[PDB]
From a paper:
We went on to first determine a cryo-EM map of the Yta7 in the presence of 2 mM ADP at an average resolution of 3.1 Å. As expected, Yta7 assembled a hexamer similar to the pombe homolog Abo1 (15). We resolved three of the six BRDs at a lower resolution of 3.9 Å. The three unresolved BRD domains are expected to be a part of the spiral, but they are too flexible to be visualized in 3D reconstruction. The Yta7 structure is three tiered with a spiral BRD tier on top followed by the AAA1 and AAA2 tiers, has a dimension of 150  × 150 × 135 Å, and adopts an asymmetrical overall configuration. We have observed the BRD tier in a spiral configuration in both ADP-bound state and ATPγS-bound state I. Because the ADP-bound state has better defined BRD region, we hereby describe the structure of the ADP-bound state as a surrogate to the ATPγS-bound state I. The spiral rises above the AAA1 tier with the proximal BRD–BIM blocking the peptide entry into the AAA+ chamber. In Yta7, the BRDs of different subunits have no direct contact with each other, and it is the BIM that mediates and cements the intersubunit BRD–BRD interaction. The active AAA1 coordinates an ADP between the α/β subdomain and the HD, and no ADP is present between the α/β subdomain and the HD in the inactive AAA2. In the ADP-bound Yta7, we identified four ADP molecules in the AAA1 domains of subunits A–D, a partially occupied ADP in subunit E, and no ADP in subunit F. Interestingly, the entry to the nucleotide-binding pocket is largely open in the ADP-bound state but is closed in the ATPγS-bound state.
The Saccharomyces cerevisiae Yta7 (yeast Tat [transactivator of transcription]-binding analog 7) is a chromatin-associated AAA+ (ATPases associated with various cellular activities) ATPase that maintains the balance of nucleosome density of the chromatin. Yta7 is type II ATPase containing two ATPase domains (AAA1 and AAA2), which is conserved in eukaryotes and expected to assemble a 910 kDa hexamer. The AAA1 is an active ATPase, whereas the AAA2 has no ATPase activity because of a lack of nucleotide-binding motif. By cryo-EM analysis, here we show that Yta7 assembles a three-tiered hexamer with a top BRD tier, a middle AAA1 tier, and a bottom AAA2 tier.
Numbering used by the authors:
A (entry chain B): 406 to 734, 751 to 939, 1318 to 1378
B (entry chain A): 410 to 735, 752 to 940, 1319 to 1379
C (entry chain F): 757 to 813
D (entry chain C): 871 to 926
């Protein structure tokens, strides 16, 4: 955990790399520029984000990248709260020694991993053992004497657990949020992990993997690549898994194929799925004909509410690159006026999706959350509120809304609003509404709620009246005839397939070599048309759930006779079922 | 020591664990080629006595302990934490550095629940620092060396969720209670170093009898059967206070010893609440077989248990070793999307009259679903633990069902479950089930006694979609009752010479060297059967069992009599 | 398997509710019965044994 | 600060003992001059030149 990593290993965090250069490498090479204004370079950064986003990798790359020249950067790394012992002496004494030896080797980086355990928040009881550590840490990090060129880096899952006196200029003046990688950063991470391989993958395959890995972190992508490689080893040379002696194998023709990555995709569960909220994922390919017609409309509406496709201001992905490629150009009437009139476009982002019971709302919500890739999703659903048994409903709601306030582009998500307004206490809705009306108009905190058979009277003169769902109510109407036709057309395409097409795996004729130790398908188109007509007629004024039920029931019948070439039996069974 | 051949079942995990401990040192070049690192950390979870510690010790002392010796550090979660305020973090750091110096190492945290529990209680702040230091020490993607952290627990949701991520415990292995084949293998393993090894039919019957047993219970059963055999073959060596009456080995462990070992050894599945998964008892089977099979067919239709030609999940190393591979792209995702399109919303609501053997039907159905992940939402399974509230327990049970995809959310006694369980958590469960995708394989099994249908379609359970999947348990028919009351008759027709009574031996125990027909006409049997069926008209399973017990007491009271006229008279008198 | 099953089928649902007038020596009857079943494993469910421990609900 | 707070709640209700007797300030809706200034500021963006807009 010391070396052999650099900044080309890191993918999708190019904005923070520039600032870390600006605080570590740049002062060393150019001390005249910093001393020109009599400023001290910022020292100490608090990395926080979802686990497996690259904080420790970022710190190691900082330590090993700025030391490429003949200016060594010693890297003192401390695990979370591993310094306190059973007595009262060593806890502060060892921190003292750490900072003194950091002073000795003047260009140095102390990395407190999991700093939330070393410096907890001051609770009601058990004060001494952690207060005596926090006080001395505060004393050495911003003492009277010049600490020197010691860059203090802390890493945490959440920053609220660190003492606020640490989150102060001179100690932790910069706080870096490491976000879950988007599609481009995931593409770059996949390219990086599959860079040293002997048989590189194609670019389009990496793009498709990046699309398929929505919700993954960097760590999840690395685990996926490792699992794909392990499956490739298992597929090429299974014999090494049986013998206890080292057989002779060749690191060749062990190229990874798509089938191995697909299997690793089911073997790996992301950190998105471990969470209790709704995992943002695109519309599954089966239901896409049914819903995508009315999902695009929502996107268009969202496009007119959050100004997603109209991004001329607040396009800050990387300030340094902006200064590199773009070019500047009285003062107030050219910056303040236009900035204000650009942020004046978001008034009060709200959206309530309300459809009949079972009309694929769990699907539309996930698709919308996937479209808003750059937004910070906060789930106010019942499961997330009640999952932390120590917290209360009100406390969880306040925590979620306050988290959504920072990281301004964010979405407060309330799936199953009809259940939510019936199982939550009446005062929590009032607290949330007071929080939302205590917001500025130009704030991009979208309130997206999905409800099943919600009465409009409850929104007009009920408890949800003070959320301002006036024009922002979208009705998810039942799917039309053409979408049902496309759904069952895919079903029929499954029906009229030859058994030589349906993938049956194998039965190998010859055993694996030992290693040296060291008919025609009969289906008239008339029957296909009759089955299509019966499916269309049976599902009249049906929702998405009923259509899925009919699809599953018919797919069972079709897959039953997946080898029979005379498909009249499956056809008459299908017709009999729809009666 | 323990090699891999002492472990019954778990061959999937046997193969999957060799790609992170054995192959990495045995084949350093095939892992350095792809620039990959083994996962380095596993979470064993399951019921006690299933073989997590045995897995760890075999894993350490089996993978090439010849020149590249793998050291094994055994620690318990309750052992690390002490009464002081900084002792345990220092102890964890010492343990990890000690494993670092002996680079190929396996640290086994038995019952990691105590060391790092979930963050919902326990102030005084020490456990937060403990969890933080454990999280920071076991970093799996910074090349800390060749330390493999194996954490054992009863249920993984009791472990801190921050530890169940890549770098920390990557793969979770479920150690189930052994099924018939695994119990057979375990019994063969335990009865392999004997001097008179047991037959195959004997072990098959023992595996059939040992229902709801684990590995530890099987070991205790074998040991106690051996002890009883020594007690019986040579009983003179107990009461005699003299010197060694040496005795060679004619000892043969027969049926009459294992059957007492069975009734003396209590399984670890007799401690957990709810219905322990086991088949229908042999007595009540004629009352409930016919209705059970239909249920199985229903469970075989809405879950695709038989026609699982695309989901044959075993050790895929085996699939690769005895199969071979195979536009070429579509054939994967099109047919894969049309393969999960068969599971739409697996729901089932078994509803019958009060006392109609629902505690048997639920257990039999669960025993049918052995390959699933049963998450019990029973009353005693949620109110037993005081560390979590009902809301949190229900949500975590649902989410552990959601993670291990083939799962059954089981709610026995739904009629009680909708009265003593607050409406808030029921609505939370409904919303959780409404947020699942249709192609998710989470079966919602509920067994209710005399539940009202208006509750299902208009009550609080209306949002669970029990609209078409209500299976009605009905009272057993006359033919089934006739077969049920056809073992008492076979107990009325057995003469006292065939009842295993006890008779004192006329001759004393030796010492070694110091170095008619029963009077019962078929008319009486016909009359007894006629009355026994006429009394049990439109009866339930509980009532039929009551009648069966009250008649069995009468039959067994006069078990030495040779003229059953009095017994027949008493039987007719009671059922009148 | 037959004889053990038929001997074990002799207990169906052992229940008993001794009900009498107020103060009719129930506190002695319970003690005498629990002494008669001294080889059993008695689990008291009275109020004094449940609210005694303040940790468990 | 309150919105649509009935004065019945503050001279004879729960808040009547907080002594809000004559210290109730009434925020009325902006008058026509305020709206005119607001929308003149809005319109001044319509009059600005495409080359005048800070488009980097
Ligand atoms: N942005 C990223 N770019 C490249 N690799 C990443 C990125 N984020 C994570 N990784 C990979 O994930 C692995 C583990 O990351 P880790 O330091 O454990 O993150 P965290 O400390 O947040 O859990 C690293 O070895 C790294 O290769
Ligand atoms: N799958 C198995 N095969 C054979 N023996 C087993 C198995 N599981 C457990 N045992 C027996 O039980 C003991 C292991 O107990 P232990 O590992 O402590 O159980 P757990 O890890 O579930 O607490 C061993 O002595 C072993 O003989």
């Amino acid at each position: 955990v010391d070396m052999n990593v650099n900044f080309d290993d890191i993918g999708g965090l190019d904005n923070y790399i520039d600032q870390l250069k600006e605080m570590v490498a740049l002062p060393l090479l150019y001390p005249e520029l910093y001393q020109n204004f009599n400023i001290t370079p910022p020292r100490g950064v608090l990395f926080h984000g979802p686990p497996g986003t690259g904080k420790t990798l970022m710190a190691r790359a900082l330590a090993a990248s700025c030391s490429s020249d003949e200016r060594k950067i010693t890297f003192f790394m401390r695990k979370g709260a591993d310094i306190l012992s059973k007595w009262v002496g060593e806890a502060e004494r060892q921190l003292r020694l750490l900072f003194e030896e950091a002073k000795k080797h003047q260009p140095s980086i102390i990395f407190f991993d999991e700093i939330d355990g070393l410096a907890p928040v001051r609770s009601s009881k058990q004060e001494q053992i952690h207060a005596s550590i926090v006080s001395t840490l505060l004393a050495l990090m911003d003492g009277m004497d010049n600490r020197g060129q010691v860059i203090v880096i802390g890493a945490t899952n959440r920053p609220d657990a660190v003492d606020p006196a640490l989150r102060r200029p001179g100690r932790f003046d910069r706080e870096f949020y490491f976000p879950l990688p988007d599609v481009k950063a995931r593409f770059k991470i996949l390219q990086i992990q599959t860079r040293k391989w002997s048989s590189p993958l194609s670019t389009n395959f990496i793009d498709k993997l990046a699309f398929l890995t929505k919700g993954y972190g960097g760590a999840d992508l690395r685990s996926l690549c490792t699992e794909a490689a392990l499956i490739s080893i298992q597929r090429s040379f299974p014999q090494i898994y049986r013998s206890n002696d080292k057989l002779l194998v060749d690191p060749s023709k062990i190229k990874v194929k798509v089938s191995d990555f697909m299997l690793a995709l089911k073997k790996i569960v992301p950190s998105s799925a471990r969470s209790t909220g709704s995992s943002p994922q695109p519309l599954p390919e089966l239901i896409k004909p049914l819903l995508a017609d009315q999902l695009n409309n929502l996107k268009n509406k969202l496009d007119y509410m959050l100004n997603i496709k109209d991004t001329t201001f607040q396009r800050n992905t990387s300030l340094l690159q902006n200064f590199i490629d773009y070019e500047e150009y009285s003062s107030f009437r050219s910056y303040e006026f236009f900035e204000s009139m650009a942020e004046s476009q978001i008034c009060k982002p709200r959206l309530l999706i309300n459809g009949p019971k079972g009309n694929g709302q769990q699907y539309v919500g996930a698709a919308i959350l996937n479209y808003l890739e750059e937004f910070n999703v906060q789930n106010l659903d019942l499961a997330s509120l009640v999952s932390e048994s120590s917290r209360t409903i009100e406390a969880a709601v306040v925590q979620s809304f306050m988290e959504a306030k920072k990281r301004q582009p964010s979405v407060v998500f309330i799936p199953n609003l009809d259940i939510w307004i019936n199982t939550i206490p009446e005062n929590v809705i009032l607290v949330l509404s007071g929080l939302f009306r205590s917001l500025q108009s130009n704030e991009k905190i979208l309130l997206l709620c999905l409800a099943e058979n919600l009465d409009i009277s409850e929104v007009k003169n009920g408890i949800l009246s003070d959320f301002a769902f006036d024009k922002n109510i979208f009705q998810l109407h039942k799917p039309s005839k053409e979408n049902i036709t496309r759904y069952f057309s895919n079903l029929i395409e499954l029906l009229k397939t030859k058994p030589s097409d349906i993938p049956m795996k194998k039965r190998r004729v010859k055993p694996l070599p030992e290693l040296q130790k060291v008919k025609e398908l009969i289906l008239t188109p008339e029957q296909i048309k009759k089955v299509s007509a019966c499916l269309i007629e049976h599902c009249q004024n049906f929702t998405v759930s009923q259509l899925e039920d009919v699809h599953s029931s018919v797919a069972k019948i079709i897959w039953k006779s997946k080898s029979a070439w005379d498909k009249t039996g499956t056809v008459d069974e299908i017709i009999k079922f729809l009666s």
